[PDB]
Structure formats: C-alpha cells, structure tokens
C-alpha cells in the first residue's frame, strides 16, 4: 500500500537529517524547511509536533506526521484540475505511484510532467515510463524513480518485492 511503499522509499529517522537535496527533514521523509538554518528547522519541527523536540521525535510521532503527509499528497491531487482526472483513471497500484511522486516533489515539482500525465491517462505505459525517466527527478534519484516508474509501467508491486 502507499504507506509501505513510501516507508521503503523514505526510510525512518528520528533525528533531523538532510534529504537528498540537502534540506532538513525528519521521520519518514517529512521536509522541515529549505532554509539553511537548523534553528529554523527545529522551529518547524516543534510547530509540527506540538512540543519542544530539540530535533528528535518518537516513532509514533514520525508515523503520525507521515499519515498527515500522505493524506496531504492525496488531497493535493484531488484538488488539482490537471492531476485529478488522471489519478481517477488509474488502478489502485498506479495511484500509489502517483501519490509517491507528489509526496516527493509536490504539485509544483510535477508541473512539468504534462506529457507524462497524458501518456498515463492514455494507458500507454511503456511510453509513459520512457517519458518519466527524461527528468531531473530520475537523474537525481534514479533507483527510487526506477521503482516508481516500474510501478506505473506494470501496475504491480514487483519493484518493491
Ligand atoms: C506525471 C506523474 C505525476 C504523478 C501523478 C500521476 C497521475 C496523477 N497524479 C499525479
């Protein structure tokens, strides 16, 4: 399911870390800030958790933030007039791949995937897979992008098994 998929892709860390882009993050891939200030990241963390955390959270707190973040990705898709029709055309496994991309890049980070979205809506899976890989996303995180792309290409969990 989407939670297991993203837990594999994001890992779990209970202290503030830096993501693949160098940005302060915690938990299961919860972005805190793009600011270079660790203090700014710590403030965001305390606001998110509701207590003074000192840069450290519990597993329960990480899982709670993760549920909120997955839901936010889903609701962002459903509120977006370009993403929603494609999402609604997909089967459940491919919908997980869609959520995964929005979780990683946000609605703004996927804005350039217009042609990929059309190919997905047309169910041209091999063509969509080729197009999805022609991206900064694929070049910078190729193993994760390959897993997501294989999920779109096949509609199976083969890349995560
Ligand atoms: C083109 C890839 C972006 C992920 C996605 C796919 C379908 C619907 N919403 C989001």
Automatic annotation (TrEMBL):
Gene3D superfamilies named among the record's database cross-references: 1.10.530.40
**Catalytic residue list:** 10, 19
Give the matching Pfam families: Phage_lysozyme
Q: Does the keyword Hydrolase apply?
A: yes
* Molecular-function GO terms, alphabetical: lysozyme activity
Catalysed reactions, as listed in the record: Hydrolysis of (1->4)-beta-linkages between N-acetylmuramic acid and N-acetyl-D-glucosamine residues in a peptidoglycan and between N-acetyl-D-glucosamine residues in chitodextrins
Q: Please provide the record's keywords in A-Z order.
A: Antimicrobial, Bacteriolytic enzyme, Cytolysis, Glycosidase, Host cell lysis by virus, Host cytoplasm, Hydrolase, Viral release from host cell
- Which InterPro entries does this one have? Endolysin_T4_type, Glyco_hydro_24, Lysozyme-like_dom_sf, Lysozyme_dom_sf, Phage_lysozyme-like, T4-type_lysozyme
A GO biological process this protein is involved in? peptidoglycan catabolic process
Predominant localisation class = host cell
Q: What does the UniProt entry say about where the protein is found?
A: Host cytoplasm
Q: What does this protein do?
A: Endolysin with lysozyme activity that degrades host peptidoglycans and participates with the holin and spanin proteins in the sequential events which lead to the programmed host cell lysis releasing the mature viral particles. Once the holin has permeabilized the host cell membrane, the endolysin can reach the periplasm and break down the peptidoglycan layer.
Q: Which PANTHER family does the entry link to?
A: T4-TYPE LYSOZYME 1-RELATED
- Say which family it is in: Belongs to the glycosyl hydrolase 24 family.
User: This chain belongs to which protein, by name?
Assistant: Endolysin
Q: What's the source species for this entry?
A: Enterobacteria phage T4
Annotated gene: e
